[PDB]
Amino acid sequence: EVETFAFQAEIAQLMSLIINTFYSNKEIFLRELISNSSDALDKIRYESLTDPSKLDSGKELHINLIPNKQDRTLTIVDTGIGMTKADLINNLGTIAKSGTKAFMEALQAGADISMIGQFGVGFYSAYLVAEKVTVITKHNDDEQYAWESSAGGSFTVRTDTGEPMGRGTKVILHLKEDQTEYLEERRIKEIVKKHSQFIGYPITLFVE
Ligand SMILES: O=C(c1cccc(O)c1)c1ccc(O)cc1O
C-alpha cells in the first residue's frame, strides 16, 4: 500500500527552483544532509540523557556514506532520532513553508543557494544532484517507513518491510547521469574535509 501526497505549493516551488536554477556549486548537498544527520544524532543523544532506554534500538551514533556505482546511488545513513510517519509527511520534520519564504526573501537580499541550510530546508538540496530521493526512516515511537519523490509535485509514503534498520534515517540519492562524480571516493573525501570536517560524529566513507 503506497500513499501519494502533494507537496505544499511553497515546497514544490522550492524544489523547482533547486532543479531548474543554474548553480554550479552542487557539492553543498552533502554538507546539508550530513548537517541534518548530525541534528538527528544530537536529538537522540539529548533524549537518551534523561531516558537511556531510547538507545535500546542502537547505542552507536554515527554517519555512513555509501556510494554504489552499479545502482548510481549515494546513500547517507545515520543512527539519529529517526522520523515518524507524521514527521515524513510534514516535510521531513522541517518548517518548510516558512523556511522556503525566508530563503526566497534571503535570495532577493543577496543570498545564494549554498545558504539554504540556514532556513531549515537543506534536505531539498539533495535535488541538486538526485533525480529521485528515497528516505528510509525508523523512529522509536513508530514503524519503519519509506518516503520517495522524483519531484514533479508529489511524494509517496509506504511501510518498509525489508531490511529493518533499528533507528535512524537513510537518505538514498538516485543520482542524475551527469552527477556520478559524487560516487568517487576522492571526491566524497574532498567534500567531507572541506565542509564537514568538525561534525561531532564519526563519518565513515564506505568503499566498493
Ligand atoms: O531524522 C532526521 C531528523 C533531523 C532533525 C530532527 C529530527 O527530528 C529528525 C533526518 C532528516 C533529514 C536527514 O537528511 C537526515 C535525518 O536523520
Side-chain angles (χ1 to χ4, degrees), residues 2-107 109-208:
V2 172
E3 288 177 299
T4 308
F5 304 82
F7 282 116
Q8 284 151 19
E10 295 78 6
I11 292 74
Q13 285 157 22
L14 175 68
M15 292 174 77
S16 186
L17 182 132
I18 287 161
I19 289 162
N20 297 127
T21 305
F22 177 76
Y23 181 72
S24 301
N25 187 33
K26 290 178 176 286
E27 70 187 46
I28 63 99
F29 80 88
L30 187 58
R31 173 187 73 195
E32 297 312 324
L33 295 174
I34 285 171
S35 174
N36 289 354
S37 291
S38 185
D39 288 350
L41 288 157
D42 295 342
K43 200 154 183 176
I44 189 62
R45 176 96 85 189
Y46 185 72
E47 287 194 12
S48 80
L49 303 174
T50 53
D51 186 2
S53 75
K54 286 188 172 189
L55 292 186
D56 287 354
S57 47
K59 290 181 188 180
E60 295 186 327
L61 302 182
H62 63 240
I63 302 158
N64 295 327
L65 307 183
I66 315 176
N68 188 307
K69 284 185 185 180
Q70 191 59 65
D71 295 343
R72 202 207 296 152
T73 59
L74 174 64
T75 304
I76 300 87
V77 185
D78 65 70
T79 51
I81 190 90
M83 288 178 284
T84 63
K85 194 190 181 182
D87 284 323
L88 280 179
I89 298 166
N90 204 3
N91 304 302
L92 296 97
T94 71
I95 50 141
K97 182 184 166 181
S98 57
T100 299
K101 179 190 170 73
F103 179 45
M104 295 308 192
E105 283 182 337
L107 290 175
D112 66 277
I113 284 144
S114 67
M115 301 165 74
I116 190 170
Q118 292 169 224
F119 310 100
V121 293
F123 171 79
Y124 301 93
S125 65
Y127 291 90
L128 292 162
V129 297
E131 63 177 6
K132 183 171 72 174
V133 181
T134 310
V135 178
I136 315 292
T137 194
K138 177 66 177 75
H139 187 278
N140 286 332
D141 301 337
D142 210 347
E143 282 188 63
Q144 190 164 303
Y145 288 99
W147 175 107
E148 188 167 67
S149 179
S150 294
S154 67
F155 63 91
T156 61
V157 180
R158 59 165 170 91
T159 60
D160 189 55
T161 311
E163 297 173 347
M165 53 197 283
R167 187 203 61 251
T169 296
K170 296 201 308 179
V171 175
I172 311 169
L173 308 176
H174 307 264
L175 302 173
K176 297 167 181 178
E177 287 158 27
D178 65 336
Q179 302 299 324
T180 62
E181 70 193 78
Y182 299 107
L183 299 172
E184 295 296 333
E185 181 179 22
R186 56 188 182 173
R187 183 70 172 116
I188 300 161
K189 276 179 166 187
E190 176 187 46
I191 301 159
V192 171
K193 188 189 168 209
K194 183 177 180 182
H195 297 291
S196 310
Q197 51 175 332
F198 302 111
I199 294 287
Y201 301 94
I203 301 169
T204 302
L205 168 56
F206 285 29
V207 288
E208 299 192 77

